Amino acid sequence: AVVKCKPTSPGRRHVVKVVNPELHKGKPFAPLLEKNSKSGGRNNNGRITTRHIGGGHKQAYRIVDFKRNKDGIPAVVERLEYDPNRSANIALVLYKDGERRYILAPKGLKAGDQIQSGVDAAIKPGNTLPMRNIPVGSTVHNVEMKPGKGGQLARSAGTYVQIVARDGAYVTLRLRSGEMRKVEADCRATLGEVGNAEHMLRVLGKAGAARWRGVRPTVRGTAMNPVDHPHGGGEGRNFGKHPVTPWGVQTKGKKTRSNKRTDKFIVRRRS
Amino acid sequence: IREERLLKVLRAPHVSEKASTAMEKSNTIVLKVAKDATKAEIKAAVQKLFEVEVEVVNTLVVKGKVKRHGQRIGRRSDWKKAYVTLKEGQNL
Amino acid sequence: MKRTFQPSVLKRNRSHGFRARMATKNGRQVLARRRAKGRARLTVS
RNA sequence: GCUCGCCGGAAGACCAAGGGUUCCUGUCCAACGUUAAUCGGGGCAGGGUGAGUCGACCCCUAAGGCGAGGCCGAAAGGCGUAGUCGAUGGGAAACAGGUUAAUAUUCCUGUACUUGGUGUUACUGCGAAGGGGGGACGGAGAAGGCUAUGUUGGCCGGGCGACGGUUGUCCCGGUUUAAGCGUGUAGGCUGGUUUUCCAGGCAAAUCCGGAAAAUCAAGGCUGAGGCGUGAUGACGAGGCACUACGGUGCUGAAGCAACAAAUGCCCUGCUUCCAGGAAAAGCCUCUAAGCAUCAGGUAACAUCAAAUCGUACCCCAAACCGACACAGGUGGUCAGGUAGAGAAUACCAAGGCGCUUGAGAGAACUCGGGUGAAGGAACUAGGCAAAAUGGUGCCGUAACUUCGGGAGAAGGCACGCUGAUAUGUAGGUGAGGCGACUUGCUCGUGGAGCUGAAAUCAGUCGAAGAUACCAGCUGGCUGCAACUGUUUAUUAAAAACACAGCACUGUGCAAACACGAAAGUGGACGUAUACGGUGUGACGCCUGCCCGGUGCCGGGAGGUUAAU
């Protein structure tokens, strides 16, 4: 459920929690975990390339399986786990042979359900297939952009691609943006919708909730001096210049798409 | 067992109150050894040159004291001393 | 009330040491200067 | 030497860092010491730092650094792979007592513990650059069991009081003992096995994972503590002994019991919450390449060894950082009594100190305090500054409200001591017993002692009983900012920044964008419920008209239009 917290303190007042009752309460499966040290937004050169990131809670990386390499092998969903490295939840899948892997939990899924993947299989939520084999006009997620790769598109909580059309070797997909992209039919896609759709109704409530998610404070250009940001200076709340990034490029309606290579695949741009 | 070199380890027998008190009561000898000089090399030197039954050798490196001669300051050399314990068959 | 020099021999040598100077093109030139000038304390070490 | 005073969650005791002989003894006061100096952290000699167990080095890693080839870069060199460094983290083992003028978990005595080596011998399959397990982990909270430690009895040795009492419910002092080894408890955690089987853990596996089962219900695991022993010992208050009045060396009494109790220890545990909580070796295990009387494991009596470096002394300071013997700054540990909720505060203990110029006088004036007739903010830019309120329990507490609050609203009253209820009770608490259940650190009766609130009632002293220290001033209207937070180190703490929330906007993943001649990194091991930018700034009610101008976006006919 989406439970609103009672106003016992200012900072608590506005908090809205997404309390999933079906998640596991305990330590995760270690073999799939590994360390994930933080950058703080800095790179090779030790310089802030991405602003406003740094701090937060320490969090380990779960090796989630996007490829779904196991063909013609059934797999029982053992337990749904919380993932700090992701918007969506994950499911500890135990394959019939012996292996265990983490996968993104679709919407219709619980501890006990069985999933199969490969070439044949059945058309059901969670069952990964080649997009050729999937019926046209169906809800998919964890969609590959290249055959044999992991899975790029629709991985966030409540996110899903819809297969619009199927032109021979190619499949026209309508993405969550509204962009209609043409991908290869040999590429795979996990059926259904990505779970944890309540995620968006979470509201943090306090400053520190953003700080313990690893975000840092965003200072407005207008607040700065002219030397710092193009917006800057003025003796008491001035502006009078067109909105811009700290590096002068115009924000607020200014197309930065310039790939050129992959412009053939885009059937129609978003709107 | 390391002939010729053993002779170069032991520099001089140490003289002091602490040196004296550990002769009769504790059955040891305090002595100035080479800056290299391992506990085995001191023991083995005492076992042949002094020719007495060595129980165990303890060692320490004494730091040189910064002296003065009008103007030009000067440090002493970092000599090493070895408390060598002896067995019941003792003498000097 | 807290001054600028807060000593530490590890930091000292890691930063300004002989090997730290030896490491780099420009660091070797510092030594090459102090040797040319003819200093006693070539580096802090 | 004797008083006095001060600190005592330190102004005491240990360290790390940092200093680098400042330590100890003998001597010398020129200079240094804010005065004198016989003294000194000063000068001049000599002495002083003793380790298989403490730390370092060593075996392993994080952040990160370096980086064979490699990719990239006019040169210099940048990035980065297999590796190899890098603790602030992980990995073997020693305590008690005695001792020096100066070191002690290091020397000494009494007891122990670890790992290797090379055997002797009993058996036997071993064996990785490889697999699995372990290491191995967050916040808060709560509860139990303990312990350091205290307090009070008893017990043992001494005391019979300089001024009235004191042979006692009296006084003073003591009542100490470790790691180790044995024991495996308070309690945590987990169904054991036994066999087969299988596209899994790039090979292989008897290990790990999965799947049948059959089959007794427990068997393991971890673990404070206590008890034993260690220890007939060690140690012990005075004595005695000598005196070089320095002490030397000789003896040694009780050496118990309840109660209380940690922020320690079990607990790296349990419950809970989400923001979902390093790594890698040692260690344990399974097999490949191999090896097959072999070498190799195993266990056991040995045996050899456990190298090297630091160890003095200061370490909230006259020894470090501040130019000074500079009221500044500096991480960790130890945490006694009485009052108290307390690591607050007051007075003290251990232990340490009285701050390296003094002696007078007792003007104005300055600084820091105390008291103040009558008035009571009349002061002043402004109640600035002082004065005032203050604790615990109980009764009571308005508009307004986001239904939590405002609120400690407001305002009251009760507080000491002494008897009683009750030769100290509610509780805590637990003994000699007695079942009993078996060999226990037993269950389960049971009420000797210690322990001890909080009340009510009745007295009683003072002017005053939360009597000291300690310890809210309160209420009404209103601007701004929702709020906690951040900010001009060293004249600005705010209405400024941030903020949760809100909108527009870019971004389809070799993402936008950023750092970068580039390779490449970050964004992100993220993928539009995501990410970057911009503005606005919780929440409630809302957010109107203008696209002429500047920008942006789309459109491609026409005009003009570069290189070629």
Add this chain to the structure above:
RNA sequence: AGGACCGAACCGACUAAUGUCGAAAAAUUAGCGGAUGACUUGUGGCUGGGGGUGAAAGGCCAAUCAAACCGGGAGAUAGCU
């Protein structure tokens, strides 16, 4: 439970007085704010000068900052004193 309340340590720096050739190139005394978190702190890293970092003051980058420091061009230049 809590960017909850009171309040020591710890972190801070609102007011006043003292000091202003200081005890001190920013402190002392008496009150003051936060004090389980957007907290604080030890040890070691990383980011470099038109560059960093900045809950944004032109703050901070070794008592130096609207462009550090050291060496060099260098005896820059000066219709000025």
